[PDB]
């Protein structure tokens, strides 16, 4: 239904993100702490569970 | 630990150079461990091939220069993933043996294609249950005698192409891998001489 390289290209801008636990910000995949100062730049992050 | 690992390596490179006044400076580039292990295991009785850190080998050379004033020629020739192989049997017999011991390696997805990989049209023995991988590449094929029949040949990858996962798996299924990497030895040291 779609070409895999194009699919992963769309994933690189929509899927492989890191989400801050608090504030739920969307961050770059190689993140350490949240960009937002709203949550206080906390350290705990999650890998944004993909689609099953 | 690392401290003794450096010291005994210094001991074993000095000892190896003591009894072998003849060597080939061999660049073991893009060679699989499986191929290197079988080559070394087969050729252990005739020769010993040693690899290691280039910056450590050159310091060992400069440390032993006080007793061997003819080791300076090796210093400019140590750069890149290049090691040494020692033998005392003949001059070119091992060179021919190394040229003949090359093994075709599998096609890894992500490595550039060395040269001219293609697939001829033939009736394989894979079966009808694995046509989804051919549909990924878009290769038009038919099914005959219970297996997959290739209609026409195709140059899937040119010389100097990135190998994808779909092509690599297809090559693995067909048990064909023109990728052959062996010894690409550069120079020969023999009692203060350099040979191509």
């Amino acid at each position: 239904i779609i070409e895999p390289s194009l699919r992963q290209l769309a994933q690189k801008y929509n899927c492989d993100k890191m989400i801050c636990r608090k504030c739920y910000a969307r961050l770059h995949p190689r993140a350490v702490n949240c960009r937002k100062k709203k949550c206080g730049h906390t350290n705990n992050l999650r890998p944004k569970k993909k689609v099953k | 630990d690392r401290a003794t690992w450096k010291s005994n390596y210094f001991l074993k490179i000095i000892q190896l150079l003591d009894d072998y006044p003849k060597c080939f400076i061999v660049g073991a580039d893009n060679v699989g461990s499986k191929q290197m292990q079988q080559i070394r295991m087969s050729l252990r009785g005739k020769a010993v091939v040693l690899m290691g850190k280039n910056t450590m080998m050159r310091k060992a050379i400069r440390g032993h220069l006080e007793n061997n004033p003819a080791l300076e020629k090796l210093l400019p020739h140590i750069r890149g993933n290049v090691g040494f192989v020692f033998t005392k049997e003949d001059l070119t017999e091992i060179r021919d043996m190394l040229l003949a011991n090359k093994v075709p390696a599998a096609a890894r997805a992500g490595a550039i294609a060395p040269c001219e990989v293609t697939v001829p049209a033939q009736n394989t023995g894979l079966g009808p249950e694995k046509t989804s991988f051919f549909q990924a590449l878009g290769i038009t094929t038919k099914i005959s005698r219970g297996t997959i029949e290739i209609l026409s040949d195709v140059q899937l990858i040119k010389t100097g192409d990135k190998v994808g996962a779909s092509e690599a798996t297809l090559l693995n299924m067909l048990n064909i891998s023109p990728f052959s990497f062996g010894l690409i030895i550069q120079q020969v040291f023999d009692n203060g001489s350099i040979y191509n």
């Binding site: 239904i1 779609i2 194009l6 699919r7 290209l9 769309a10 994933q11 690189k12 801008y13 929509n14 899927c15 993909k50 689609v51 | -």
Partner: protein, 190 residues
């Protein structure tokens, strides 16, 4: 602490010529002339040596929050020099599942109209900022090429159309649709 001196130098190709008017810089090359203002960074720029081979940017007695600004100017200048000697070419590909994305170029690349995005009848018209040119490339099914001189304008235009091609009120982890920047490239290869 405050570092006494922090400087970096940038090489200048012979085909290009760069001059300084106070703190702003102007670069003239084969493709054209591009200018940029740095009146908010408070550094020193020196075009040392004849035949303008090197440009040195230094700062004296700066904290770590401002010593970082010394090298970002070097990147800006070298990126600008690349954009004037060779230019910037951003190639972005349209990704869709069922509905094809109809991209039409108007007023010689100034305006891009997007139709049939997720099948909706709404037409998305995005106006490129001045200084860039858009064209649907050949030798490919779906591809858009943005050619320009300054990365800010080129990538801002690419961001504009990419953000325009968005799916809302749905799961973006499945509806992988839109025009996405695939490769960052150069108009002229060295």
């Amino acid at each position: 602490m405050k570092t006494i001196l922090s400087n970096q130098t940038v090489d200048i190709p012979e085909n290009v010529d760069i001059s300084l008017k106070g703190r702003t810089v102007i670069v003239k090359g084969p493709r054209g002339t591009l200018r940029r203002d740095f009146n908010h960074i408070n550094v020193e720029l020196s075009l040392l040596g004849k035949k303008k081979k090197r440009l040195r940017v230094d700062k004296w007695w700066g904290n770590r929050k401002e010593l970082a600004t010394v090298r970002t100017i070097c990147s800006h200048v070298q990126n600008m020099i690349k954009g004037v000697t060779l230019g910037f070419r951003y190639k972005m590909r349209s990704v869709y599942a069922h509905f094809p994305i109809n991209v039409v170029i108007q007023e010689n690349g100034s305006l891009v109209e997007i139709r049939n995005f997720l099948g909706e009848k709404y037409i998305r018209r995005v106006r490129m900022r001045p200084g860039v040119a858009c064209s649907v490339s050949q030798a490919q099914k779906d591809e858009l090429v943005l050619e320009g001189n300054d990365i800010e304008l080129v990538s801002n235009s690419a961001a504009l159309i990419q953000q325009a091609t968005t799916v809302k009120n749905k799961d973006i982890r499945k509806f992988l649709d839109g025009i996405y920047v695939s490769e960052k490239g150069t108009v002229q290869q060295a």
